Amino acid sequence: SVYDAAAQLTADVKKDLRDSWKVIGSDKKGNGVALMTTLFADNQETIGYFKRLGDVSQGMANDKLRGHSITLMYALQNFIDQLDNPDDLVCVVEKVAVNHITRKISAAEFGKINGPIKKVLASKNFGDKYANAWAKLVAVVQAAL
Amino acid sequence: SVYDAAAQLTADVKKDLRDSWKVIGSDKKGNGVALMTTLFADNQETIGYFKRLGDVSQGMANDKLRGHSITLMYALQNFIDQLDNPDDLVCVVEKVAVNHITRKISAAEFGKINGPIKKVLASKNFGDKYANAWAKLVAVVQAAL
Ligand code: HEM
Ligand code: HEM
């Protein structure tokens, strides 16, 4: 299942992920927090999963939130670095999914991160072409949930 | 406290962490697994915490262990990248600590990673000078458990 979703990561899709990531991933703190704040803004309900973070409206100034956002970017950094070896990409995606399964986060719920990503990509001038590429990466994780 | 431990990361200590990581962090999969396998060999008692990984003796062949080992290396990557800003290094360390606290991993238990790190370092021509620099870093996390 996860392997089949990985099959969707074609040569062109991978090229767009590595290219857009060369920019998005150059500022993990900034872009990471931008992602989380956009998620909470567009889907206020997802906040119910982050009670441990406290006052998330403080954004960047919130140490717990900032700490979480930076760590999230390194998960994506991990996935991007494993794009050329489906075997490693899968074992890594399944590792990440473990804790989200325990948190009772469905695939549909996880998919809500697509909007935030699309917006963050556009702030850097990356059109739908890149947005679709990333939706395919998120789909690999969703296949594991 | 974690804040006083982070202050222990002096100029030369940070330089030694960067120089050694430049080599170690080159092969995250290889060194990551060597690290986990050495831990299980020198401290069989810690194996009980990794029941989910299955037969840990399979090493590289065990997909779960490989997924875990790689991800671990990205956590170290994260720490290294935050050495410039103590504030960010702290929120990132406390973040990682959370799940370990939930697993009831004590500071003393966590410190057992120092042995494996020293060995991997030596296998790459990095002696006591660097092993101690990493022990300092590890202590930062120990101060948050
Ligand atoms: C691009 C997608 C995402 C990535 C790469 C990602 C990555 C991570 C990582 C690496 C962690 C830290 C390790 C762990 O505890 O599992 C984490 C924590 C967490 N994630 Fe995800 N995540 C993503 C999306 C989401 C979404 C959409 C939700 C829920 C709406 C979610 C909820 C959580 C929660 C509740 C935590 C714990 C936060 C805390 O209390 O510190 N994640 N995630
Ligand atoms: C360099 C030292 C270490 C670092 C940076 C580190 C980092 C991590 C990371 C990033 C994860 C994945 C995310 C999560 O589930 O929280 C993890 C999982 C875990 N860590 Fe640590 N860890 C280290 C040492 C240890 C030690 C010494 C133990 C045990 C004595 C330990 C026990 C665990 C366990 C049981 C898991 C869950 C594995 C699973 O079920 O997949 N860790 N660690």
Ligand 1: residue of A52, A72, A120, A134 to mutate (most ligand atoms within 8 A of CB) is A72
The answer to whether A64 and A52 are in contact (CB under 8 A) is yes
3-class DSSP state of B78: helix
Residue B82's nearest CA partner among A70, A3, A133, A13 is A70
Cβ contact B92–A70 (<8 Å): yes
Give the CA-trace dihedral at B72, B29, B86, A27, to 10 degrees. Answer: -110
Counting atoms of ligand 2 from 1, which one is nearest the CA of A95?
41
**Chain A contact for B72 (CB, 8 A cutoff):** no
Ligand 1: residue of A99, A104, A112, A121 to mutate (most ligand atoms within 8 A of CB) is A99
Number of neighbouring beta carbons within 10 Å of residue A103 = 9
A78 lines ligand 1 (CB under 6 A): no
What the block records as the tokens of B97 is 């600590």
- Number of residues in chain A: 145
Smallest CA separation from ligand 2 atom 26, residue: B110
The answer to whether A72 and A83 are in contact (CB under 8 A) is no
Cβ contact B63–A90 (<8 Å): yes
Closest ligand (CA of A78): 1
**Per-domain residue ranges for chain B?**
1-145
C-alpha to C-alpha distance for B76 and B79, rounded to whole angstroms: 5
Q: How many CB contacts within 8 angstroms connect chain A with chain B? A: 68
What the block records as the tokens of A40 is 């909470």
Long-range own/partner contacts, residues A27-30 (CB < 8 A, 24 or more apart): A28/A69, A28/A70, A28/A73, A28/A74, A28/A77, A28/B81, A29/A60, A29/A66, A29/A69, A29/A70, A29/A73, A29/B88
Q: Has A68 been labeled as part of a binding site? A: no
What the block records as the tokens of A61 is 């100034």
C-alpha to C-alpha distance for A41 and B61, rounded to whole angstroms: 43
Residue B140's nearest CA partner among B14, B27, B36, B20 is B14
- Cα separation values, B44 from A82, B39, B47, B54, B108, Å: 30, 8, 6, 14, 15
A28 lines ligand 1 (CB under 6 A): no
Task: Say which residues have a Cβ less than 8 Å from residue B34's Cβ, sequence separation at least 6.
Answer: B120, B123
**Chain A contact for B74 (CB, 8 A cutoff):** yes
Does 1.10.490.10 match the CATH number of domain B1-145? Answer: yes
